[PDB]
């Protein structure tokens, strides 16, 4: 997260870190045994880390649970990042309380202008590299389809939306991928891509979760 703020320990209780010896992506807990992330985060050998604030220090609310299966969306195209979404099942159920909690799926697609909370452990610099160790947060509005397509001609599908600031300075970034965009208490986006970070007229691009609620529910119901 570039230009954000320190969330505070366990204030984003659905935020997970995907660990394969190191944090490599975020995700969102959507029930006690399922996490949703970005398909471009896929790898074997994932351990899901819940209850994290400082990902380099054991602070006392962590749950470390290995993945039993990962399901990349059947239509994921890694070249275009269309359908950049995947589901990760936990080997055992997470224990849920105030510091570890699932985030509700949307009942509808949120509108341009809605303010959302974007969070992750990714790079905090647009020129250079500094990773924060504790969870960072950003409040940002969903942008119109027309501003999104004008920023990224030929690249925005119906499964994507932009959020952030056309002036730059505030954005998600490398290492935030797979993590949440939450608006009015519902998971509306997954951190997916962007040209650099916090650049002018290059806002963040996010997987549009509302398109995938039926796939997520039916996948969970049969796996
Ligand atoms: Ca920790």
Give 76-99 as a DSSP string: -BTTTTBT--EEEEESSPPPPSSS
Q: Report in angstroms the alpha-carbon separations of 65 from 12, 77, 104, 126, 152.
A: 18, 28, 21, 32, 38
Task: Specify binding-site residues.
Answer: 52, 54, 57, 62, 171-172, 174-175, 177
**Residue 95 and residue 7: Cα distance in Å, rounded?**
22
Compute CA 212 distance to the chain's CA centroid, rounded to the nearest angstrom.
Answer: 14
Whether residue 136 sits in one domain with residue 116: yes
Whether residue 43 sits in one domain with residue 7: no
- 156: CA distance to ligand 1 center in Å? 36
- 170: CA distance to ligand 1 center in Å? 25
- 107: CA distance to ligand 1 center in Å? 32
CB atoms within 10 A of CB 165: 18
Whether residue 140 sits in one domain with residue 40: no
Taking a C-beta distance cutoff of 8 angstroms, is the pair 172, 1 a contact?
yes
Whether residue 45 sits in one domain with residue 4: no
Whether residue 132 sits in one domain with residue 87: no
Whether residue 179 sits in one domain with residue 111: yes
CATH number of the domain at 35, please.
2.40.10.10
Active site residue 104: no
Longest dimension (CA), the chain: 46
Whether residue 170 sits in one domain with residue 89: no
Task: Specify binding-site residues for Ca(2+).
Answer: 52, 54, 57, 62
Catalytic residue among 28, 40, 70, 102: 40
Q: What number of CA atoms fall less than 13 Å from residue 91's CA on the CB side?
A: 11
**Residue 220 and residue 210: Cα distance in Å, rounded?**
16
Q: Whose CA is closest to 83, among 208, 187, 178?
A: 208
- How many domains are there within the chain? 2
Catalytic residue among 70, 84, 102, 176: 84
Whether residue 178 sits in one domain with residue 123: yes
CB atoms within 10 A of CB 30: 21
Q: Can you say whether the dihedral through the CA atoms of 220, 187, 185, 105 is positive or negative? A: negative
**Residue 124 and residue 203: Cα distance in Å, rounded?**
15
Active site residue 53: no
**Residue 185 and residue 54: Cα distance in Å, rounded?**
24
**Residue 20 and residue 66: Cα distance in Å, rounded?**
10
Give the range of the structural domain holding residue 2, as residue numbers without chain letter: 1-12+103-210
- Give me the sheet containing 180-183, strands edge to edge: 5-6, 136-141, 115-120, 180-183, 186-193, 204-208, 160-163
- The experimental technique behind this entry is X-ray
Whether residue 218 sits in one domain with residue 206: no
Looking only at the bridges linking them, the beta strands covering 180-183 and 115-120 are antiparallel
Which stretch of DSSP H or E encloses residue 148?
A: helix 145-151
Rounded to 5 degrees, φ, ψ at 218 are: -70, -30
Whether residue 197 sits in one domain with residue 113: yes
- 10: CA distance to ligand 1 center in Å? 10
Which stretch of DSSP H or E encloses residue 146?
A: helix 145-151
- 104: CA distance to ligand 1 center in Å? 24
Whether residue 121 sits in one domain with residue 204: yes
In SS3 terms, 41-58 reads as HCCCCCEEEECCCCCCCC
Active site residue 40: yes
Whether residue 199 sits in one domain with residue 107: yes
């Amino acid at each position: 997260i570039v230009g954000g703020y320190t969330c505070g320990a366990n204030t984003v209780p659905y935020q997970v870190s995907l660990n394969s010896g190191y944090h490599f992506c975020g995700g969102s807990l959507i029930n006690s045994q399922w996490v949703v992330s970005a398909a471009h985060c896929y790898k074997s050998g994932i351990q899901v880390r819940l209850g994290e604030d400082n990902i380099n220090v054991v602070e006392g609310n962590e749950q470390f649970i290995s993945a039993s299966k990962s399901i990349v969306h059947p239509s994921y195209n890694s070249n275009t990042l269309n359908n950049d979404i995947m589901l990760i099942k936990l080997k055992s159920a997470a224990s849920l309380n105030s510091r570890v909690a699932s985030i509700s799926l949307p009942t509808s697609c949120a509108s341009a202008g809605t303010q959302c909370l974007i969070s992750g452990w990714g790079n905090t610099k647009s020129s250079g590299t500094s990773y924060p160790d504790v969870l960072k947060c950003l409040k940002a509005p969903i942008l119109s389809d027309s501003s999104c397509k004008s920023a990224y001609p030929g690249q925005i599908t119906s499964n994507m939306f932009c959020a952030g600031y056309l002036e730059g300075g505030k954005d998600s970034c490398q290492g935030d991928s797979g993590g949440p965009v939450v608006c009015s208490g519902k998971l509306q986006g997954i951190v997916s891509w962007g040209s650099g970070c916090a650049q002018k007229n290059k806002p963040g691009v996010y997987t549009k979760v509302c398109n995938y609620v039926s796939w997520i529910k039916q996948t969970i119901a049969s796996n």
